């Protein structure tokens, strides 16, 4: 399949699914651009390189607590209960929250590598799983 995909077996149901080890995306169905546009939702934690945001002057949550928050947001976005944009605007620990998480367009070479690799491995309209950087934990949405 496309870059980074492996076949796996559901631990609960036993049904085949597909997992991407670059984006941390997972899906039931069987699955590089010079520039991409992405949005993100960042949840910071106490070990983030800058443990502060517009939401909270001192970010004290643990990495484990941050991951739980990220996992919950992913659930709500995938279920359609919430839009990615809505959750980014409300809960992202990044100044880009004011722009619905939009970071604009970019080529490779500009940023932290796990974020870059995930961004360039996503298809248009596809969303990542939890992506870990020195900043915290990200959900990334490729928009263009
Ligand atoms: C890992 C994220 C993603 C970064 C952005 C990727 C795209 C980009 C390309 C550029 O050419 C210039 C800027 C951006 C838009 C980008 F690099 C930056 O905004 C920084 C981003 C969000 C980031 O590193 C961050 O979350 C820093 O947060 P803290 O510093 O608080 O730890």
Curated annotation (Swiss-Prot):
InterPro entries: PPIase_dom_sf, PPIase_Pin1, PPIase_PpiC, PPIase_PpiC_CS, WW_dom, WW_dom_sf. Its EC number is 5.2.1.8. Expressed in immune cells in the lung (at protein level). The phosphorylated form at Ser-52 is expressed in normal breast tissue cells but not in breast cancer cells. Keywords: Acetylation, Cell cycle, Cytoplasm, Isomerase, Nucleus, Phosphoprotein, Rotamase. The keyword Isomerase applies. GO terms for molecular function: beta-catenin binding; cis-trans isomerase activity; cytoskeletal motor activity; GTPase activating protein binding; mitogen-activated protein kinase kinase binding; peptidyl-prolyl cis-trans isomerase activity; phosphoprotein binding; phosphoserine residue binding. Changing residue 52 to D/E: Loss of peptidyl-prolyl cis/trans isomerase activity, nuclear localization and cellular function. Phosphorylation at Ser-52 by DAPK1 results in inhibition of its catalytic activity, nuclear localization, and its ability to induce centrosome amplification, chromosome instability and cell transformation. Ser-52 is dephosphorylated upon IL33-stimulation of dendritic cells. One of its GO terms (cellular component) is postsynaptic cytosol. The modification Phosphoserine is found at residues 52, 89. The keyword Chaperone does not apply. It catalyses: [protein]-peptidylproline (omega=180) = [protein]-peptidylproline (omega=0). Coiled coil: none annotated. It is an enzyme of class 5 (isomerase). It comes from the Eukaryota. Residues 1-31 form the WW domain. It is found in: Nucleus; Nucleus speckle; Cytoplasm. The WW domain is required for the interaction with STIL and KIF20B. Peptidyl-prolyl cis/trans isomerase (PPIase) that binds to and isomerizes specific phosphorylated Ser/Thr-Pro (pSer/Thr-Pro) motifs. By inducing conformational changes in a subset of phosphorylated proteins, acts as a molecular switch in multiple cellular processes. Displays a preference for acidic residues located N-terminally to the proline bond to be isomerized. Regulates mitosis presumably by interacting with NIMA and attenuating its mitosis-promoting activity. Down-regulates kinase activity of BTK. This is Peptidyl-prolyl cis-trans isomerase NIMA-interacting 1. It comes from Homo sapiens. The gene is PIN1.
């Amino acid at each position: 399949l496309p870059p980074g995909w492996e076949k796996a077996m559901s631990r609960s149901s036993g049904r085949v699914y597909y997992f991407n080890h670059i984006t941390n995306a997972s899906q039931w169905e069987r699955p590089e651009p010079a520039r991409v546009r992405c949005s993100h939702l960042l949840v910071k934690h106490s070990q983030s390189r800058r443990p502060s945001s517009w939401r909270q002057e001192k970010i004290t949550r643990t990495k484990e607590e941050a991951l739980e928050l990220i996992n919950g947001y992913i659930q709500k976005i995938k279920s359609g209960e919430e839009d990615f944009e809505s959750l980014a605007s409300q809960f992202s620990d990044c100044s880009s929250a004011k722009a619905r998480g939009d970071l604009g367009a970019f080529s490779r070479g500009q940023m932290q590598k796990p974020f870059e690799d995930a961004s360039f491995a996503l298809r248009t309209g596809e969303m990542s799983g939890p992506v870990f950087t020195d900043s915290g934990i990200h959900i990334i949405l490729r928009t263009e």
